[PDB]
Amino acid sequence: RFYFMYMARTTFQAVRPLLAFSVFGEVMKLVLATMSSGLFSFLFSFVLAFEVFYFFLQCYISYTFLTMFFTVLF
């Protein structure tokens, strides 16, 4: 069972950035497709920037957990 647990954890930590980049991207794309005015767009630019920062945070977390999971003593 430990092998299954480990592979699950590894795959989750590996796909975390892909999710942050793809599904939240689809949400942003829905919003872009639906919005027309200028005030809402001005306010949504900051959401896009926050998504940038969140993607970088997820990438850092994944890097940390992956260097923990792929570190061998011998």
Partner: protein, 253 residues
């Protein structure tokens, strides 16, 4: 290209939003020597006043015992010396060379009292003054100018080239590159502009912190190297000075 120069000063530059400006000229243009890779004919020419140099040359030639050279050079140079403009060696560099190569204090003081501080010696002057070849003097001047490449050099102005073909190719470029929805894409607005703008803002806001954090190690290494060099040289010098008086044993014996 190699980084020429005898200086240990770790120097970095910060840029402005203004371009370098030089006095207007209808025939010349200023450019970087390493980026242009100019030739002797690409260099611009001008006329320089002789007398101040011809007097010193007559003196040196009367001392050395070669007056045919002075006569020939004076007959060549009358009405001014026509020479490439930005191929020269400064008085300070020349004095350093003389001193490190063993010219006497009398000759060095003669140079100093004869020429102003901002005088610029060109390769024909150097050749006729040291009995060398103008080719070698030209190469030396070029190396000494490349050692200080922040100063632009003056070349002959040339009209642009291949403007018609360049126009055709640029039209083709726009015709194939703007006939698309790239600059209006959801990908653009979601990734390209946000990521790029965030990188640009962070770089503009931490422009100096980043540079300093990167250059810390190099500065420390350069400091360490210079300190080691100095201490070793000083120790060796003082020890040889201590042992300098070990030759008189023979003449005493």
């Amino acid at each position: 290209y190699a980084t020429l120069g005898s200086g240990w000063s770790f120097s970095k530059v910060q840029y402005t939003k203004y371009r370098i400006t030089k006095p207007w000229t209808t025939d010349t243009t200023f450019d970087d020597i390493i980026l242009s890779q100019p030739s002797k004919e690409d260099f611009a020419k001008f006329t320089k006043e002789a007398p101040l140099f011809l007097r010193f040359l007559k003196l040196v030639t009367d001392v050395e015992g070669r007056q045919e050279a002075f006569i020939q050079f004076a007959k060549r140079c009358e009405n001014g010396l026509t020479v490439e403009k930005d191929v020269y060696v400064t008085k300070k560099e020349l004095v350093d060379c003389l001193w490190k190569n063993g010219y006497t204090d009398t000759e060095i003081n003669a140079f100093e009292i004869a020429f102003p501080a901002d005088y610029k010696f060109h390769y024909p002057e150097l050749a006729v003054l040291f009995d060398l070849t103008e080719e070698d003097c030209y190469k030396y001047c070029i190396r000494q100018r490349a050692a200080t490449p922040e100063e632009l050099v003056e070349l002959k102005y040339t009209k642009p080239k291949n403007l018609v073909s360049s126009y055709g190719l640029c039209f083709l470029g726009v015709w194939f590159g703007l006939s698309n929805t790239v600059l209006s894409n959801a990908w653009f607005y979601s990734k390209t502009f946000p990521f790029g703008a965030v990188f640009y803002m962070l770089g503009s806001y931490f422009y100096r912190d980043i540079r300093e954090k990167l250059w810390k190690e190099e500065k420390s290494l350069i400091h360490t190297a210079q300190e080691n060099k100095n201490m070793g040289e000083e120790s060796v010098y003082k020890q040889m000075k201590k042992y300098a008086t070990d030759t008189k044993c023979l003449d005493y014996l």
